[model samples]
Target: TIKEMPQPKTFGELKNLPLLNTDKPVQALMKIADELGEIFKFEAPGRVTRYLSSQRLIKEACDESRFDKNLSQALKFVRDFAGDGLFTSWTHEKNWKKAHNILLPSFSQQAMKGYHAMMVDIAVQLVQKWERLNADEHIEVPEDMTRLTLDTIGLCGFNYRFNSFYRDQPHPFITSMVRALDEAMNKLQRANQFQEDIKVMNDLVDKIIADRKAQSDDLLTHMLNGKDPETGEPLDDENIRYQIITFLICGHETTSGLLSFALYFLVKNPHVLQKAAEEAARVLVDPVPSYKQVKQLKYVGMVLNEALRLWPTAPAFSLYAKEDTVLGGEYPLEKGDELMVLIPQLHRDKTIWGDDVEEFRPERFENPSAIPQHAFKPFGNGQRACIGQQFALHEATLVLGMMLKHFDFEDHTNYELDIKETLTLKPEGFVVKAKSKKIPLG
Candidate 1:
């Protein structure tokens, strides 16, 4: 237990972090970087933590030989329901490899190509719903994106339909999943509180499992059909249930948040909106973009990249010393001392991103080479890095690209960028009025 180490700045009275910035947490990070820390660190009496935000240490932290994904207390809550699903599973857990191999083919280029039509279908449902709205009404962007992504995942991942666009309120499926994830912060609260929510969430996943009809190709099909190469048996029902909910929660939530923030950045920066809109219109010459054309939607892809770079929806992931090792060659962290790789902060590596680090400039993402290596990891870090990286990228680009092509968005609320976290980050109290771009047929 390495309880203390000398770093650029150590918080003596860091216990009052919440009191320091009551409303804006992002501001708290900036305040640390600008006013106090001007560097990296943190400390508690028995629990010493190294919060890595700079480019230098994050590079070293990326070295898998030195560090591995730390299963912090928060992750245990996920394990409570997810039951060793890829996102929440321990590296040493045997099932993770089994599930990873089974699920890998579902997200591949050819497989995702099979999913393109459903992706197009769900994006249409969202835009069409937005099309029906009165031009003056402000649409809650995050809420809508969730509907689209969740529904898309349902249909694409397992051939189910959440029918989010056709519904009046949020589906109980998402409500219960949100509640289950929300309880992780308080260990005591969940032991009892999760009974009802977990029941609801579990019931839904089990239904998806029992009602399973293996179709052309989907995650459920893979889980049901594919066998563990090691054991030569299918994943048992219990583990399959965990994989379902894991994908249910993991697949849509981050992408929805990404879409929400991307939309906010688009509305806030009109020049970006114009460039994005023009690209979407030009490349998606057909009503829907073909999967091959998705690659050509380069600027739109950059727009998503910048949105992720600035306000990563998955935000942060935890890493710890796997064994006795020095971090960044300066901080000697013993095995198990937790290190926080703050993704959003690292994205603003001013040394690499420049004086405009705070700005939403999509053009900066034009060249991946110019940017320093391993600094822009919104999907997360290494082996545990998001397995659905391409899935989320394709999902957000198709939806965001279609959104820019379909609507001329207007804002009246003057919504300042404020964040709301429910296991993932999203804009709070944000709304936009989007008028359809499609002209009436003659």
Candidate 2:
């Protein structure tokens, strides 16, 4: 057996270790970069952990040759937290392999195109609400965007509609989901305060899965009927239920964060905002951009990409070492050690991206090859790269394009990143005011 490294002797001494408080994750990352450089070991509650914030090292670590993303002990809690679905299953190879094969077809080009109309339809509802607001009255972008994405996910991913836009109070689905997610994060002190919500969601999903008369093209249809290429077995109801919950959680918040932060950054950098709006006006001749038109809105893509770089929705991720390995060509890690990839630090590394790394420059992504490998992994990399990358891009581009065409947005608050981190990064108090462009509605 390999010898383990020595740990700090006491919690007081452990507090002195390099890792920062979990509450202030981004600030902790910045401190890590300043004090300990790109790589360092830190002591946590019961374990000593290593982190990598360099681009090259992050690249190698994500590659198949250097690491296998074995779920850590804490990550294993997700299976219980999320009801033991495919996303949280501890068996990385078998479960992911099967699930990936079955789910890939659902996110294909044709599948993504099918979702464009739903995205635009939901986006229109948001614009309609914005139209009602007077110039001085600002809408909380984060809250509105969250509602929009939640409604879109219901329609696109599950063939259900929450009509979240019309309600003053959150829909029961949103209320239950919020409680369940809060319990997952350990915010609730009571025993299973989330159980009723979990049952509510499960029963809803069960009914959807149980009764299917006609074949439809939505993701749930694919999940229910899609076959595993290797074993030729369809996903069982339990497996399908887990996947439904997983998509609901994953698909909703990340895109909401994407739109919220994208607008925040655009409002912060007026030149980029102008360029993005110009591209939107040119390509989105139609009030609702089709998938092809969405692709043509390149500057919108760059703005969203840059926003993702600065504030990746799923900010920090952990990959456990499957075997002994060396990271950054110097730091040696033992089997089962958790490698924390501080994405915020990696994305802002001046060494790879030059001195203007912190600035919101969408043009950085204009030529993809200019950026170093793995340095720009907003949605991550390797086999576990976000399945919803194109899906998200499509939805964000369509909504952003529509917003540009219909209204002019102004940041109603001073520009500071008041961020809240849950399963994703969200803008805490971001607000925007919109005035209709008022070009004749011909």
Candidate 3:
């Protein structure tokens, strides 16, 4: 005799807590767990209606039509569409490996070598601009970082030069992209408002493909080569769009977000910044960070990891289960149920992260293998994780390390960091003023 089940009346009742176990999968809820989760369901027998209800709702809600209308039209294609590509195909491994396989070749030793050199040059350009402006007391670091990363993506990912960093006004594409992503995430946060943006992101990719057809580059060329050796399937148009979307979504936002957070942290904690400066001075004295040198900079990696942990770009993800399942013993979910696992909330959970989880500690990730899988999932977990984690990590390490090597950042302590929780979490306009640093010992 199971007494925990709720007498569900409607889907909304099922979604509310105390009755619905927030931890259950979508499949389990519709099939059997709905009652267990306290979901109000009509005590009647119907096969097809019960079975298809969850799947239909989840699919329709997440479709491009809903995504574009609600999520920002700009990033609608990238975040939502790319996500669709990943979610639609549940059969494949869908693990981080799949994304890694696609991106690794792009960031090979030889490739990162070249990319690192370009990044250094761009960083220098940015630093020079900062100097020219006498380092603005109020700076929108995310905006600048986004431009920089967008340019970097263009140069490395497609062998094109976006020159977004130099533009006085936001570029049309970038503006649209940011808007779309912001809207999409906002809509996600408020599910009721999610279906307004019709992100025709694939059309943009199609245009890029069309442009590439006339002029050849590494992106289109790579797709022509076939499915990743690691995945053993052709990189279809949808897959290709997913990759482009991933780069645009993951690359620009995550890098910019981290840089903003890193700068914010450095300004606040002068001591950590000093240590990072010392590490950077030794590694970046050559005016360029080689791939090998980048790899050896342990402190650089730690700082980035810690910063990401402190302020992840998208701190929560809602998982709508395709099946009825039990999670962490206590939470039992019915099929077609949605679970919002707030990374920030989960991140700060004492049971999982211990007493000092809230503290800014880079050393925590010094030996990353020690961290638990579920708790430290800044890039996310399960099959549908971010693909460009390594690429973004490598890029961030170089940019930050090189910047640290040359300058000491000071805080505009008066200006509180108003984090713009757009599609991605970013620092509000707070200029991290940098002072030229004297070289420190490695």
Best by TM-score: 1
Candidate 3 lDDT, 288-377, residue by residue in tens: 567787887788788888888777776544444465654333335566554433444445545555788667778777767766546665
Residue 74 CA displacement from its true place in model 1, Å: 1.5
TM-score order of candidates, top first: 1, 2, 3
Candidate 2 residue-wise lDDT, 1-442, digit = tens? 4334333233473453333435444555567566667776666545555667788778877876667665543345456545555456643546566778888888857998888788878988888888888755888888888889888888888777778898877666667766655444443111225567866866766655555533568888878778889999777756777888788777888899999999999999898888888888888776456778988888898899999888888776677777898765566777877876778888988889898877999988889888888898877667777787888888888888888888888776685888876546788889878889874322
TM-score of each: 0.91, 0.90, 0.73
* Cand. 1 TM to true fold: 0.91
Model 3 has a clash total of: 43
| lDDT against the true structure, each candidate | 0.78, 0.75, 0.57
Among the numbered candidates, top lDDT falls to 1
Query: How many clashing residue pairs appear in each of the predictions shown?
Result: 0, 0, 43
Tens-place lDDT per residue, model 1, 57-133, is 78888888888887766677778888888888888788887887778878868888998888988877777788788
